[PDB]
Nucleic acid binder design. Structure first.
Ligand SMILES: [K+]
Ligand SMILES: [K+]
Ligand SMILES: [K+]
Ligand SMILES: [K+]
Ligand SMILES: [K+]
Ligand SMILES: [K+]
Ligand SMILES: [K+]
Ligand SMILES: [K+]
Ligand SMILES: [K+]
Ligand SMILES: [K+]
Ligand SMILES: [K+]
Ligand SMILES: [K+]
Ligand SMILES: [K+]
Ligand SMILES: [K+]
Ligand SMILES: [K+]
Ligand SMILES: [K+]
Ligand SMILES: [K+]
Ligand SMILES: [K+]
Ligand SMILES: [K+]
Ligand SMILES: [K+]
Ligand SMILES: [K+]
Ligand SMILES: [K+]
Ligand SMILES: [K+]
Ligand SMILES: [K+]
Ligand SMILES: [K+]
Ligand SMILES: [K+]
Ligand SMILES: [K+]
Ligand SMILES: [Mg+2]
Ligand SMILES: [Mg+2]
Ligand SMILES: [Mg+2]
Ligand SMILES: [Mg+2]
Ligand SMILES: [Mg+2]
Ligand SMILES: [Mg+2]
Ligand SMILES: [Mg+2]
Ligand SMILES: [Mg+2]
Ligand SMILES: [Mg+2]
Ligand SMILES: [Mg+2]
Ligand SMILES: [Mg+2]
Ligand SMILES: [Mg+2]
Ligand SMILES: [Mg+2]
Ligand SMILES: [Mg+2]
Ligand SMILES: [Mg+2]
Ligand SMILES: [Mg+2]
Ligand SMILES: [Mg+2]
Ligand SMILES: [Mg+2]
Ligand SMILES: [Mg+2]
Ligand SMILES: [Mg+2]
Ligand SMILES: [Mg+2]
Ligand SMILES: [Mg+2]
Ligand SMILES: [Mg+2]
Ligand SMILES: [Mg+2]
Ligand SMILES: [Mg+2]
Ligand SMILES: [Mg+2]
Ligand SMILES: [Mg+2]
Ligand SMILES: [Mg+2]
Ligand SMILES: [Mg+2]
Ligand SMILES: [Mg+2]
Ligand SMILES: [Mg+2]
Ligand SMILES: [Mg+2]
Ligand SMILES: [Mg+2]
Ligand SMILES: [Mg+2]
Ligand SMILES: [Mg+2]
Ligand SMILES: [Mg+2]
Ligand SMILES: [Mg+2]
Ligand SMILES: [Mg+2]
Ligand SMILES: [Mg+2]
Ligand SMILES: [Mg+2]
Ligand SMILES: [Mg+2]
Ligand SMILES: [Mg+2]
Ligand SMILES: [Mg+2]
Ligand SMILES: [Mg+2]
Lengths: 52, 183
RNA sequence: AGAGACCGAUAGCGCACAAGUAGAGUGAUCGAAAGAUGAAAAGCACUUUGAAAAGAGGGUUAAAUAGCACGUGAAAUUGUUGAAAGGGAAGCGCUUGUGACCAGACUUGCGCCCGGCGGAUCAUCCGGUGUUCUCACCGGUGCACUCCGCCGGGCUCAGGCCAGCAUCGGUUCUGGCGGGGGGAUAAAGGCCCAGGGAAUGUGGCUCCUCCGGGAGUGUUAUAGCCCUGGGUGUAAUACCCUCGCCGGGACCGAGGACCGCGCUCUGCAAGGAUGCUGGCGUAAUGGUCACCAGCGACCCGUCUUGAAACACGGACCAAGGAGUCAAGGUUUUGCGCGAGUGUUUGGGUGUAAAACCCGCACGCGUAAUGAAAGUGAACGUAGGUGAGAGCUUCGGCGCAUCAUCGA
RNA sequence: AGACUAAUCGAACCAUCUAGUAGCUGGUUACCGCCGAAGUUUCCCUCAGGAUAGCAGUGUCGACCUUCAGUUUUAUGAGGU
RNA sequence: UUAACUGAACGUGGGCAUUCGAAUGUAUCGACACUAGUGGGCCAUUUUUGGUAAGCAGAACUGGCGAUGCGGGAUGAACCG
RNA sequence: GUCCCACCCAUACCCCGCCCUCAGGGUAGAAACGAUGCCCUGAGGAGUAGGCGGCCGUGGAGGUCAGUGACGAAGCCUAGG
RNA sequence: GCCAGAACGCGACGAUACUACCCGCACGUUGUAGACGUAUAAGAAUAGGCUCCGGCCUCGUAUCCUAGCAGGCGAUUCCUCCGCCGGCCUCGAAGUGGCCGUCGGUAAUUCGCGUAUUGCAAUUUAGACACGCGCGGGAUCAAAUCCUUUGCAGACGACUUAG
């Protein structure tokens, strides 16, 4: 008799998507990038950039 | 705005009879119930033909029934939502059982004198509530004097509206090449 | 002479009346308007003012709001009384205000307990009679912790109008905070290391003026600046994208036992608002009318490509005022009978223009085609092929109708 | 003078045929609901008028018929701006 | 029809979804019957004919006004939304 | 002349209530229904000429309310409901 | 200079019967395009000014006033601030301010008694001008029109005159 909006009503969101609680609990929206020291631009990408 | 070609389109088919016969109303209530509570396609067809007018329910004769009682239909039940008439040309009537909206006096007498039986459409629902072992028959729709006049025009070979028949009634100019042209 | 699904005084004949009359025209001829006091005249005796017409009293009557200018007595238009507005039209739409006037609603209801009062006979059983054949009614028994009614006291619940707060649901506007990702893994920048330059040349050195200063010289010194690599460094920040968490306001509450999908699962924010509290119980909320205020608003009908038009009709009100009836066609809806169908030109009969009954002819249909003399509809289970609703023993049979080849 | 013939004369007055005919001007009476145009083709002593096709409404019937389309794509023709 | 069962049209029997052979939509499939009003039109972007030109006269495709209110262009049938 | 923020309001767009129109479903071993009723779900609403449907009023006729009325029928007036 | 004079523009003066007028008091039967601390006087320049003569200026982001039953009754304490009257001057653009005197009130400091019940919000009915009414005191004893008349005037009203 009355449409309710998920993204505002949490009970409705859990009815349609049971994985929502796990997504929030494990913070899957804040995953960090893989480790590793990055290389640098190979000194000719930069020469072409300022070429003209 | 919504940009639609059509709106508030009505249905093209009847939804109830236009008659005021009290017994026809009882018959329509019976088959409304049957069509809703059964999966038989036979019941839905019978309901629609009870709404129709007399030119959409042409009569059926005993000769037309005998034609369709051949090739393995000798023991089925004939169903006709119309009047059943007699045929003088048929000299020997086979035995059969027919359920019809109504029978003429001579049609009913000849069916029973040959060992058959006649039913009413409400007796049929009691004995065959699903229409098993039946054959539905319709009469000739276009065998009407008025249909011969429809679509008159040049090179159409239809019947004209004239007040008499003879040599003096529309046979001279436009009907033969010895007076101008032909049609 | 008898009648009617006719008209009811602008109708029905021109005439419901001293109507073919009054009146017009030389004449032939033309030709209206005009019905209603009360049951009964009982149609106002007397007094008084006035020259009189009349007025004021007083009488008759059920009624003079029936007085012969006579049943009822509408509108245009007018008088008096009362209310109100008006700085070169008025009238009208939406929405508040003021004044006048006003309809509802509410006054209690059911239930429980305690006491008093009165009347019965409450449950059970026996006899009779109905009826849905197991359910009732009547007679008898019952006889005080049962049944019924009234009054007095207490308690719970539900009840009228306008509002305040708390916890929620739907929609929406607007603040703040915590993270993640990308690009030259931002570009700059601070600090540190190494190399190279110059000028709008710092300090020195020289000359001109002491009158503040100015002009040369040349590369960091007693200031500093610009290029090229490297480290801190996966630095910070801007911009773009993205995952969440807290505040502040506005409008709305459709539905009416349970049932479903679910969750943080003694329960809940999960298929639509409940809980607590105050004032008032009447003109307080609400309604009608008049007027001032803000915004808006050209005269209708008609022909026309185009009307508010310097385009035509319309001063105002009442009553009348325009797609009908017959014969003959046609398509479609309803009804009776059906290879047939139609009693009513006529006859019989009658409670008499009704209703009821009868059947010889005849009309339309059942057969066409030719100018005509004339001739006149099956090779086949009334044919073959492709579609086709419905039925089916699942192999097929195939209505209506459409296309096609034949008889 | 086309003047006069009873306020009437380039053919008097009165009644009747007569409600004479009009492709032309004027009018044509309560409410709500749904759908919704044309000024174009051909013929007519046709050009202020008709018939005919188109555009519109209403009633249905056949199946609820793999059925269609003011459109894109792919292959393949025609054209003299 | 061919010198010719050689062809031409119509077919029996058998084989082929292991996929009925581009995209998108289907917010409207087919057939019939009876009939109304209309048959003076005008405006605009692009293309265009006659004319010195015209709020002039004449055509093609499409969109409008007529038949239509509302917010803008102070006003303003046709312009913008 | 060019560039950039914030803000104002249409009968347009989004959400909610109510009216009507159209479409699609449910409802009998009837504890049953103005079945021409009731319950559930979605979409739509401009209009001259014109078409169709449903309703409101007036004068008379058949049937029925065993209808109202001299203790007051019909008619007329009324910024009273 | 010259013509008209707003018939809803203004000034000075004369006489004013009817309690029409003046003063004082007390009420509301009343009206107001809209009180709620309705508080604030230099002139001048802006590529220059103010001043206490030391200095100061982007900035009214200022200054004044502001406590108590809608603001009681006493005390301690202080010589400030406010108001009604009266007397002198002063003010003409549409007439205002200053000085003095009597009287009344008064937290700059610190206390004692009272406040309740309007029930958990409902305008805080509070100001200023006008108008009306009723008392108590003073002051005052007027004109205009019709009518008759004139002709410096005239369609009629109106106008210049006389009674
Ligand atoms: K000939
Ligand atoms: K008459
Ligand atoms: K005469
Ligand atoms: K009486
Ligand atoms: K009397
Ligand atoms: K009377
Ligand atoms: K928020
Ligand atoms: K980064
Ligand atoms: K660095
Ligand atoms: K130097
Ligand atoms: K709803
Ligand atoms: K006209
Ligand atoms: K006119
Ligand atoms: K018929
Ligand atoms: K016959
Ligand atoms: K089939
Ligand atoms: K004469
Ligand atoms: K004509
Ligand atoms: K060419
Ligand atoms: K051959
Ligand atoms: K037509
Ligand atoms: K036509
Ligand atoms: K024209
Ligand atoms: K033109
Ligand atoms: K406009
Ligand atoms: K009637
Ligand atoms: K105190
Ligand atoms: Mg719409
Ligand atoms: Mg008679
Ligand atoms: Mg009369
Ligand atoms: Mg008469
Ligand atoms: Mg009379
Ligand atoms: Mg008298
Ligand atoms: Mg009377
Ligand atoms: Mg009279
Ligand atoms: Mg009278
Ligand atoms: Mg009147
Ligand atoms: Mg007025
Ligand atoms: Mg007993
Ligand atoms: Mg909320
Ligand atoms: Mg880095
Ligand atoms: Mg970084
Ligand atoms: Mg509700
Ligand atoms: Mg209360
Ligand atoms: Mg009121
Ligand atoms: Mg206006
Ligand atoms: Mg004009
Ligand atoms: Mg005219
Ligand atoms: Mg006129
Ligand atoms: Mg009449
Ligand atoms: Mg003469
Ligand atoms: Mg006529
Ligand atoms: Mg005539
Ligand atoms: Mg429409
Ligand atoms: Mg001709
Ligand atoms: Mg015309
Ligand atoms: Mg089909
Ligand atoms: Mg269909
Ligand atoms: Mg060419
Ligand atoms: Mg025409
Ligand atoms: Mg043109
Ligand atoms: Mg023209
Ligand atoms: Mg027109
Ligand atoms: Mg438009
Ligand atoms: Mg406008
Ligand atoms: Mg303009
Ligand atoms: Mg409409
Ligand atoms: Mg009549
Ligand atoms: Mg009466
Ligand atoms: Mg009136
Ligand atoms: Mg003056």
């Amino acid at each position: 008799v009355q449409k309710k909006n998920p993204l505002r009503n949490k009970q409705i969101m859990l009815r349609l998507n049971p994985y929502a609680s796990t997504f929030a609990k494990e913070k899957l929206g804040e995953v960090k990038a893989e480790e590793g020291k990055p290389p640098k631009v190979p000194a000719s990408f930069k020469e072409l950039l300022h070429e003209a | 705005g919504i940009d639609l070609r059509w709106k508030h389109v009505r249905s093209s088919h009847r939804k109830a009879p236009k008659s005021d016969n009290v017994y026809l109303k009882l018959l329509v209530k019976l088959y409304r119930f049957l069509a809703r509570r059964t999966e038989a396609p036979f019941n839905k067809v019978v309901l629609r033909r009870l709404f129709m007018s007399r030119i959409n329910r042409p009569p059926v004769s005993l000769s037309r029934i005998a034609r369709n009682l051949k090739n393995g239909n000798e023991k089925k039940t004939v169903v006709v939502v119309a009047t059943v008439t007699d045929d003088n040309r048929l000299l020997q009537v086979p035995k059969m059982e027919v359920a019809a909206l109504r029978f003429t006096a001579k049609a009913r007498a000849r069916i029973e004198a040959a060992g058959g039986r006649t039913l009413t459409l409400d007796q049929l629902a009691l004995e065959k509530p699903t229409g098993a072992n039946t054959l539905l028959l319709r009469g000739p729709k276009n065998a009407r004097e008025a249909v011969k006049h429809f679509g008159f025009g040049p090179h159409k070979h239809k019947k004209p509206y004239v007040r008499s028949k003879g040599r003096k009634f529309e046979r001279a100019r436009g009907r033969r090449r010895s007076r101008g042209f032909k049609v």
